[PDB]
Amino acid sequence: GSHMEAVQNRIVEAAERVPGVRGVIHLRARYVGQDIWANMIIGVDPENTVEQAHEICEAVQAAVCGKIRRIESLHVSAEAREIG
Amino acid sequence: GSHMEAVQNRIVEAAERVPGVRGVIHLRARYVGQDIWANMIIGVDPENTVEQAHEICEAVQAAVCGKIRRIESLHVSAEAREIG
Numbered sequence A, B: 001g002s003h004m005e006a007v008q009n010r011i012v013e014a015a016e017r018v019p020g021v022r023g024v025i026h027l028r029a030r031y032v033g034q035d036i037w038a039n040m041i042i043g044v045d046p047e048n049t050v051e052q053a054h055e056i057c058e059a060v061q062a063a064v065c066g067k068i069r070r071i072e073s074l075h076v077s078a079e080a081r082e083i084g
Helices: A001-016 A050-067 B003-016 B052-068
Strands: A023-032 A035-044 A071-080 B024-033 B035-044 B073-082
Touching: A001 A023, A001 A035, A001 A050, A023 B024, A035 A050, A050 A071, A050 B052, A050 B073, A071 B052, A071 B073, B003 B024, B003 B035, B003 B052, B035 B052, B052 B073
Parallel strands: A035 A071, B035 B073
Antiparallel strands: A023 A035, B024 B035
């Protein structure tokens, strides 16, 4: 794949290892100049409250931002997902 | 304020009228070229499940995208919020 597909795969790999993540559903990653701006949607269990799902999102943010360089902006949201 | 503050205020106004929204907590809006890319975090009640909060987010997306021109990318997430 392209450079950006390789970057996308590394971001997904970092996120999918976080407890409570049921896969990465979507990732929009773009270079704006020399920095990445990314929007991620993760799957979580339906049983989560909104706060519990947000805490998973925050753990994903911390994981991705800690591992993946050059990201200027990351926004992570969750959808209930019944498969993985 | 600036042009972008006026744009931000219109986006917030569109979102905050959607049932179940407990204010707009955050909005990052930027021009990338001639288009707006926006990340929004809304407050919702803590009692929401993740799916219920996601449905509010989707209603916000539809409302903002339907009313506000020039947005190329909008990502809306929710946080539990005990005040409004």
